[PDB]
Amino acid sequence: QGLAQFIKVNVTLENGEPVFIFTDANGQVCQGDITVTQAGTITYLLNDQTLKGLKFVGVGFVTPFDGIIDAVTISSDGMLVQLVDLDKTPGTTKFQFVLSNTANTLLVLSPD
């Protein structure tokens, strides 16, 4: 049985636009990137400080079928998204947080 990791997705505005700053369990800024050495879960908790009503709607992939991440779950309030990574398939995948906001009807994406 595996690792449950917890990362906090703090989002701020700078120049009127969102910036994503990731924070580990110790309160340290991290790059966001992870390594999975066995089957487990990565839990991301949204700390929206943009005043823009952000909610997670999903986690987006340019190579969604590469099998690195097996599933995505999300909470009914959009504050939490979890990835299931069963760690069968080796390799690397890049993803982006997809979020709704209350200022407008466009979706927000974290940087590629």
Binding site: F22, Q31, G32, D33, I34, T35, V36, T37, Q38, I42, I68, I69, L83, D85, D87, K88, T89, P90, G91, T92, T93, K94, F95, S110
Partner: peptide, 7 residues
């Protein structure tokens, strides 16, 4: 961000 798998 990036995720790296190593079984």
């Amino acid at each position: 961000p990036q995720i790296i798998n190593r079984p």
